[PDB]
Amino acid sequence: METFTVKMGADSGLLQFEPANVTVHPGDTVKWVNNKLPPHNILFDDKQVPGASKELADKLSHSQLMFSPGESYEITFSSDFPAGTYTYYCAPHRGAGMVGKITVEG
Amino acid sequence: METFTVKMGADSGLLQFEPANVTVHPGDTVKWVNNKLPPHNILFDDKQVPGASKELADKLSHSQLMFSPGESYEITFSSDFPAGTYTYYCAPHRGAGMVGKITVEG
Amino acid sequence: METFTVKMGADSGLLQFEPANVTVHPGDTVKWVNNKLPPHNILFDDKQVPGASKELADKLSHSQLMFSPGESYEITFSSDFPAGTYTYYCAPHRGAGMVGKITVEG
Amino acid sequence: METFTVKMGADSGLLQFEPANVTVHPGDTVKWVNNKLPPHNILFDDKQVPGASKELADKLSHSQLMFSPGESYEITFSSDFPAGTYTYYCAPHRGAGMVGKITVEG
Amino acid sequence: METFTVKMGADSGLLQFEPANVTVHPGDTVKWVNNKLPPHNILFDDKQVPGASKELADKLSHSQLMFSPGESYEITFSSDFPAGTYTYYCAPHRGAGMVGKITVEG
Amino acid sequence: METFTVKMGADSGLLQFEPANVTVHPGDTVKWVNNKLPPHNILFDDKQVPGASKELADKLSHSQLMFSPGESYEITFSSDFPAGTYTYYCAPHRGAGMVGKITVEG
Ligand SMILES: [Cu+2]
Ligand SMILES: [Cu+2]
Ligand SMILES: [Cu+2]
Ligand SMILES: [Cu+2]
Ligand SMILES: [Cu+2]
Ligand SMILES: [Cu+2]
Ligand SMILES: [Zn+2]
Ligand SMILES: [Zn+2]
Ligand SMILES: [Zn+2]
Ligand SMILES: [Zn+2]
Ligand SMILES: [Zn+2]
Ligand SMILES: [Zn+2]
Ligand SMILES: [Zn+2]
Ligand SMILES: [Zn+2]
Ligand SMILES: [Zn+2]
Ligand SMILES: [Zn+2]
Ligand SMILES: [Zn+2]
Ligand SMILES: [Zn+2]
Ligand SMILES: [Zn+2]
Ligand SMILES: [Zn+2]
Numbered sequence: 201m202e203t204f205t206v207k208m209g210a211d212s213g214l215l216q217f218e219p220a221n222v223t224v225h226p227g228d229t230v231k232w233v234n235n236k237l238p239p240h241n242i243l244f245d246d247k248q249v250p251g252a253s254k255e256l257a258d259k260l261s262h263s264q265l266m267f268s269p270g271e272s273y274e275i276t277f278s279s280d281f282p283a284g285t286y287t288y289y290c291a292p293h294r295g296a297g298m299v300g301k302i303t304v305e306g
Numbered sequence: 307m308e309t310f311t312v313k314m315g316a317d318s319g320l321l322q323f324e325p326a327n328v329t330v331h332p333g334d335t336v337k338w339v340n341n342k343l344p345p346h347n348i349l350f351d352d353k354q355v356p357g358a359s360k361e362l363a364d365k366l367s368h369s370q371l372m373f374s375p376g377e378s379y380e381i382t383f384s385s386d387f388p389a390g391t392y393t394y395y396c397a398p399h400r401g402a403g404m405v406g407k408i409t410v411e412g
Numbered sequence: 413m414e415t416f417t418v419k420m421g422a423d424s425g426l427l428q429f430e431p432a433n434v435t436v437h438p439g440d441t442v443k444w445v446n447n448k449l450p451p452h453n454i455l456f457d458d459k460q461v462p463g464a465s466k467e468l469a470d471k472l473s474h475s476q477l478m479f480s481p482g483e484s485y486e487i488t489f490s491s492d493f494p495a496g497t498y499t500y501y502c503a504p505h506r507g508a509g510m511v512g513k514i515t516v517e518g
Numbered sequence: 519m520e521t522f523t524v525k526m527g528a529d530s531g532l533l534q535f536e537p538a539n540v541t542v543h544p545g546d547t548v549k550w551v552n553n554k555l556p557p558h559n560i561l562f563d564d565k566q567v568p569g570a571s572k573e574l575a576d577k578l579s580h581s582q583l584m585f586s587p588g589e590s591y592e593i594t595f596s597s598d599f600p601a602g603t604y605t606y607y608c609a610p611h612r613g614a615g616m617v618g619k620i621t622v623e624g
Numbered sequence: 625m626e627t628f629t630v631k632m633g634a635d636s637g638l639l640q641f642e643p644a645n646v647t648v649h650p651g652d653t654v655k656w657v658n659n660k661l662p663p664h665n666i667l668f669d670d671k672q673v674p675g676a677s678k679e680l681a682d683k684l685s686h687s688q689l690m691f692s693p694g695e696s697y698e699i700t701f702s703s704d705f706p707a708g709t710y711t712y713y714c715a716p717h718r719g720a721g722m723v724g725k726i727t728v729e730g
Numbered sequence: 731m732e733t734f735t736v737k738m739g740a741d742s743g744l745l746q747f748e749p750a751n752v753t754v755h756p757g758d759t760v761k762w763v764n765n766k767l768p769p770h771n772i773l774f775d776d777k778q779v780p781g782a783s784k785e786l787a788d789k790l791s792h793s794q795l796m797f798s799p800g801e802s803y804e805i806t807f808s809s810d811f812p813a814g815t816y817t818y819y820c821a822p823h824r825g826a827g828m829v830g831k832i833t834v835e836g
Contacts, residue, residue: 213744237826243370246379264455273458296767320531343614349476352485402555426637449720508661561794564803582667591670688773697776
């Protein structure tokens with residue numbers, strides 16, 4: 201049972217989540233930490249989560265912008281969460297391809 | 307049991323939903339398709355749905371922007387949904403009066 | 413039992429919630445009325461409401477922009493709402509420190 | 519010696535200049551009038567005027583936004599102006615292809 | 625021969641130039657100093673300066689945004705400047721009525 | 731005599747002018763080419779060019795946004811341009827420190 205940290209804005213100054221792709225196990229937690237060039241947010245589309253569930257995509261999205269360095273958000277993927285891929289994106293930096301994918305393994 | 311299709315942005319290039327007003331029967335589905343001049347989204351204000359239920363207005367809204375041509379979002383109005391009007395709008399094009407109204411009938 | 417009115421944007425023209433800090437009881441209602449310099453919205457971060465409950469913060473947030481004068485949003489704090497502080501802000505005027513705080517008491 | 523009027527935003531509500539293409543004679547004047555869905559402006563890029571003269575493109579642009587209905591801006595093409603095409607666009611509505619072209623003839 | 629300082633954003637936090645109205649004499653200088661709630665800029669419309677001269681309105685406009693406190697801009701009104709009123713506005717805060725007027729006396 | 735190319739947005743995806751700092755001679759040309767993550771523009775503040783000449787800073791600024799890849803703007807620095815440093819920036823990516831500097835030598 202582990203916590204994976206994802207940086208919001210690469211140290212370099214690149215507009216990415218790093219790491220962009222993470223694989224986690226039921227019981228684990230992804231923690232987003234505000235890093236370079238804020239603001240960022242974390243959105244999952246209706247069609248971009250297991251079973252295309254809007255209820256679930258909405259529950260997980262953190263649409264509110266995160267401004268100061270240090271600001272964070274955790275999603276902990278309990279065994280209620282269906283296995284599969286959770287593709288998310290940052291709204292202000294969608295143009296730049298600020299994208300991420302979480303895979304919940306088996 | 308049928309699916310009504312609403313275009314986002316008229317073929318003409320006008321910034322409206324087309325058709326803006328639709329009447330539907332319980333069990334039917336409304337499907338928005340991204341047509342002209344993206345991006346669009348679909349918002350239902352708290353006071354704009356039967357019983358002014360924010361819980362329900364929120365469930366239905368798709369506040370995330372739809373950018374690419376062909377993207378779609380469906381609401382299907384099962385027998386849980388109260389009879390009456392559901393009035394909505396596109397945030398980016400609020401200024402242009404890009405508004406719509408679904409009427410759940412009988 | 414009562415309804416506390418909160419102006420969005422002060423009479424003077426300052427970008428504030430007025431009154432900013434409010435103490436309510438179980439059974440009471442907070443009503444936000446659109447006043448000066450719209451648009452405004454009312455956002456609760458996940459970490460900013462008792463128990464740090466995102467479910468709660470999301471249910472309470474009115475992220476949709478309120479534009480026309482006199483537009484309103486009420487939250488009525490029943491026995492169900494946990495006692496404690498609910499700290500909110502206005503997205504468009506966050507830079508200006510357009511912030512507020514509701515304290516549910518006993 | 520005449521004045522051609524160009525509407526900013528078609529009566530239909532379409533985001534174009536109307537008429538988008540105009541031919542004028544030396545000594546004539548083009549007058550833009552703010553019509554539907556303000557705000558608009560008029561920009562001529564450096565490379566979009568005869569001889570790709572930035573000095574001239576800049577003179578002609580009215581980058582400031584026109585907000586209220588009835589606002590207008592005139593260019594009058596005296597004999598100083600080189601013969602040829604002057605292609606322009608509206609910044610806010612670039613995405614919608616709100617573009618126009620004046621042709622100074624003979 | 626004097627320099628009139630104008631604050632960009634009132635100490636209170638109000639979105640105004642203070643003083644909003646200034647009367648100056650040929651040879652004097654108005655100095656805008658970035659104060660509260662940046663960014664601000666200073667625009668004069670074509671029609672808003674003596675003789676409706678776009679050449680003059682453009683020369684005087686400081687459209688570029690001013691971000692850090694302390695940033696400034698001077699216009700010194702030599703006797704080439706025609707007497708009369710120079711109405712200007714801040715673009716980001718046009719909605720708020722962030723407006724100013726300089727009168728060049730006799 | 732030569733043309734110095736400056737990429738707008740680095741190959742890597744960083745929001746930079748590349749090369750940022752450039753030394754040119756009288757007779758030489760600086761060409762900005764639109765590269766990654768558009769749009770960009772090229773702004774010279776009034777205080778940021780030799781003699782603090784606004785006339786000069788404005789003549790040189792390309793405030794209009796460049797959108798499509800390969801779009802370009804050249805400034806060719808003749809005997810007429812005062813020796814010294816011309817410091818520029820990109821409005822949209824100012825937050826990211828998308829800055830540059832041209833030094834005209836002897
Ligand atoms: Cu981002
Ligand atoms: Cu739309
Ligand atoms: Cu506000
Ligand atoms: Cu327009
Ligand atoms: Cu301002
Ligand atoms: Cu840039
Ligand atoms: Zn694990
Ligand atoms: Zn969607
Ligand atoms: Zn039916
Ligand atoms: Zn509402
Ligand atoms: Zn009472
Ligand atoms: Zn009470
Ligand atoms: Zn948060
Ligand atoms: Zn003619
Ligand atoms: Zn250009
Ligand atoms: Zn004086
Ligand atoms: Zn004008
Ligand atoms: Zn050479
Ligand atoms: Zn050289
Ligand atoms: Zn300046």
